[PDB]
Amino acid sequence: ESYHKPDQQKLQALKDTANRLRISSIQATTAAGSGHPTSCCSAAEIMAVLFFHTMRYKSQDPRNPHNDRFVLSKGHAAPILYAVWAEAGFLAEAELLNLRKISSDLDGHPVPKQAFTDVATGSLGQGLGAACGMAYTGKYFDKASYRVYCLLGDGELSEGSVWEAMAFASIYKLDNLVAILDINRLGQSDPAPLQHQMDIYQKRCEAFGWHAIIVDGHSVEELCKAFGQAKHQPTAIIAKTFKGRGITGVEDKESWHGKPLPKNMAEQIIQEIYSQIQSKKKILATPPQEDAPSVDIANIRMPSLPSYKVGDKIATRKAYGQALAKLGHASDRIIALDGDTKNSTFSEIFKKEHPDRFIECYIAEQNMVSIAVGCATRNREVPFCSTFAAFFTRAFDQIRMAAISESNINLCGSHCGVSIGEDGPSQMALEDLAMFRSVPTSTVFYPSDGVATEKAVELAANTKGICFIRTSRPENAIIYNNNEDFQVGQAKVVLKSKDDQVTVIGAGVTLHEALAAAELLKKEKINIRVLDPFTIKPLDRKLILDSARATKGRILTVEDHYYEGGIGEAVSSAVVGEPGITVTHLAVNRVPRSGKPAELLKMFGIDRDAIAQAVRGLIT
Amino acid sequence: ESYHKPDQQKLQALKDTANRLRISSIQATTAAGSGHPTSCCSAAEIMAVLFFHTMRYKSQDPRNPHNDRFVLSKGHAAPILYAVWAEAGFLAEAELLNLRKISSDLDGHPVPKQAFTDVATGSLGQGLGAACGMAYTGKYFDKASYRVYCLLGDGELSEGSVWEAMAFASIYKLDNLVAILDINRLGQSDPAPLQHQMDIYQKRCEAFGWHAIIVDGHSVEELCKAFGQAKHQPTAIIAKTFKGRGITGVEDKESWHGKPLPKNMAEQIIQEIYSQIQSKKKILATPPQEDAPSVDIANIRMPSLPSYKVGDKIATRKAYGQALAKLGHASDRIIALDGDTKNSTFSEIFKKEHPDRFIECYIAEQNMVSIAVGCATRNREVPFCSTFAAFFTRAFDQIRMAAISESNINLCGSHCGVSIGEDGPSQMALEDLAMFRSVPTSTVFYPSDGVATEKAVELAANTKGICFIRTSRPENAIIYNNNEDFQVGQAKVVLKSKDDQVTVIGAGVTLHEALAAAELLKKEKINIRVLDPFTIKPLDRKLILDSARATKGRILTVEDHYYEGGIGEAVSSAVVGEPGITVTHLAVNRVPRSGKPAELLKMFGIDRDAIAQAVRGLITKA
């Protein structure tokens, strides 16, 4: 528990370690012909001290739940991360030279195929948010003794997402979290704005509620001391460093970001660094206190079937909140996050019933997603984030990186489409199906009534990858029996007859408009089949085609979304080339405007009358 | 101009104005049955003072280029924006009651169909970045006397994009920019984190380089004074206010965000507010000094044809930088913005030749897009932003709102696809076609060689809407003669014969892989047509279909992008149902990994061998 104040030999061993890490970073990037040795070298003493004095972890089990966490937010310093894990004895030294090869898992930036990596970085400014999720989990959910350390670059601090995380950590008193800022003066293509104005970094961190300490980032002794003192606040170690530290003629110079040393130069530089190393003996890592709780990864089931009634009206946004609160009674792993929209998404229902497991993330969608990713690391939590679907576009890079991180998070976006009415297009999600479908690990649920919403929540909880649930504002009727079985990739035919003329595919509000169109068309002796996809990704291609074959090959898809990347294009891509199949597509063709929900569905050509007229035109 | 220190009669008129603005915000939202009167009421004195004391603008010409700019970043206070423009005499007072109707343009949040709105807000945290672009333009490009005022909420300040803009304004010494923070204690669903800890707001703004003044936001006199002193720094007026100010029993209470007053309550509250108004006489706006320069809005033409030769090798990312620098010599309105990637996107070439028109935005893509939107307002500048295409996903909400803002900005994203090689997937754009295709005003250029890249830059400069140019890292051959004519929505058939068995659609690196596949397949007496879309949106449906009908109805798309929302899906959606047409699709099926470019194209099934195998399979299945 006490700080072990290192003696001169331990300090020299830490310096020797830092210099070994420099040598390896150079060797690996020169061998690869690409990479960022100068970005590694500014961080070498930081890495040596964290891994070989401060942190506590099992060197042979990097994912162990009791370990301190390290997040390399400046992910292009990956070679020095790999070098520390070789120094710690987990990774074979020889493998370091295979950096960036297709035959290796030592890829250009860290990724979770590496046991020692929890989240992928490489898109700057995201690691601190993930670290915040890890620290929040450690302090409030696991209630364990592990600490969380996150290394950032100085150019990286221009990303607004970093400052969302800074504010989150002070709001939530993450006194188990340390941010290390590698203030090496330079970004990629010029000096970072503040250069070596260390006092301005300190003021910014202090103003955001952090205990901020300026250190010489190349002093192993100052680093040991600064890391050795816990605080009652999140702690920022503001390290003055030089980019390319230890590389004579490159240290502190522009024009070297992401530039490997040519072989002749690497050999000369490595010789000079090696001349400064006093012993080949390596420091051993020190193991953690094993106080993280056991976690059960069993499937999570709703405590009962849905208790809706066919014909009753409920918006799927409200059904989401009810279903999430219900699921929270079945497993303590379920956590909810929301960005100051809990009264609109109905995640407030979960907050009321399970307040200890609700995280108010404020108006900061980027950070919210990163918090969720962090909470899901090491399978600790099962997170459900929510906001308006439109505002998940604010977090697309975090979502993109979440898939690269192989993260299991659940996102529920409300207020989709023009059917929200009067707020207008700033609040209307019209591109969220395109966005989430383009995330390669995604499952996209579009529930059309309250029953389907509850089933989607339960399925999402038990589905790997990036799960998105699209909810809606109109109160529409319950159409499904409570005991209707739902599965990912299985659609439902909600209206059919022996002489259906076209298969109409709708979802959410447009499913209900399609059912209303069917009633209008019956008066003209025209029957239509109506199909509810349930999941847009994966799509039930078989049921769609079997339906179309019963309806003269004709499909009409109607969606409250733009034309590109949504339901209609998913359907077209699934059926193109099938003999006799035709697809007509109704969607929103341009930025909308304010009006009543029904007025906008009409203006944008996706209401019952537009559907009926499209059907009449197809038959003729 | 000297500060006009107001007399008590002017101050009382400003209070009367603020109370009229409260009344109108309540009347309009009660009439609509929705909206945010409490968010209007905290800002009523701020709005009165800005519009009727501080700012200079032409009340009958809100777009006038000499006017001070006002940006309502907290856009859900739109009813009070509409009320000020009625008070100024531009809008008819009766029209305010038509808020949110389909028959009105007084929509729920501000939009540029309103003459008095430059950028759409409603997605919080974006207005200050737009304002920074307006202020940068005013100080460095227009070199004019107009100032820029941006009103933000307190919950809104949780958005990181705000702090990017804060830092930008101090870096760039935007002493013509004022941010007004409506510190009304409350967000939507709870108190804002800092509540009324005014000293913490001050410390945060000062630490980010702003001159920060705490005021009573309901004191017209303190507001006049704080706005009346210009500074050498961007200035933050940190206004302590109460949400719902002036609505008895609602002021300072939770549970009222976005809740209109019921009719009975509106009538009673309005009576009380009206009892505080001393005079019905309105204040007149004061017009501006007309020192903004005249701008030439003519078509922009490259000064010469591309200077490439067929067979030369160049990466389209480098051709972009060369073309942009060349365009800068043809028009004074071209500006370039980049997020600390200028040596990778080659926007550095423009910086070297036209340094006064390059804006370093640092590692802050959200703000970069907003800056560009601000610079393009009132048609002052023609901006080209650049970064890696993957990092435009960090700015998708800004891009989305740029289309809602009817903005003409140009975005060039480099390093697309797996063909970048060793950096791995964090840098690989594999969803940018899906993203930009879902932006409704977008034109998506995917140039396959240096010639097509230069033509795309020129076309983009003259094309309205959100223009995206997808550039690439491999150094592929020039295939077009310099004198080839290019047009939005027109594809090119780059290889054809009377015996073609498939039409293969590729772009960028996969066009070159398709041409290599064609050379391989000729050894087996198999000819393929190869088609280069040029624009993915709009797609040349006619040429694609005419090509397919000459190649046994068969189309094969191949793309360095995920399957969803890219070239293959665009093509399938364009041709579905056409008799005899089939589409096969090669794309990237999962998150990639590091390797050499050619190794990754092979691993992910989008190289010459994958194309050749798919072609053979189509022939043999028939």
Ligand SMILES: Cc1ncc(C[n+]2csc(CCOP(=O)(O)OP(=O)(O)O)c2C)c(N)n1
């Ligand atoms: C979101 C994002 N935008 C742009 C980049 C491109 N890029 C990679 S590293 C880098 C510079 C990082 O500089 P800094 O944070 O100072 O780190 P250093 O290498 O100096 O330690 C940039 C611009 C990135 N990877 N991520």
Ligand SMILES: Cc1ncc(C[n+]2csc(CCOP(=O)(O)OP(=O)(O)O)c2C)c(N)n1
């Ligand atoms: C990016 C974004 N996220 C979420 C919202 C949802 N939303 C609309 S207004 C609001 C609260 C704004 O509070 P504040 O900024 O304090 O403004 P006030 O109404 O108090 O003046 C929220 C959360 C939004 N419009 N934009």
Ligand SMILES: [Mg+2]
């Ligand atoms: Mg740096």
Ligand SMILES: [Mg+2]
């Ligand atoms: Mg507020």
Ligand code: NA
């Ligand atoms: Na990061």
Ligand code: NA
């Ligand atoms: Na899930």
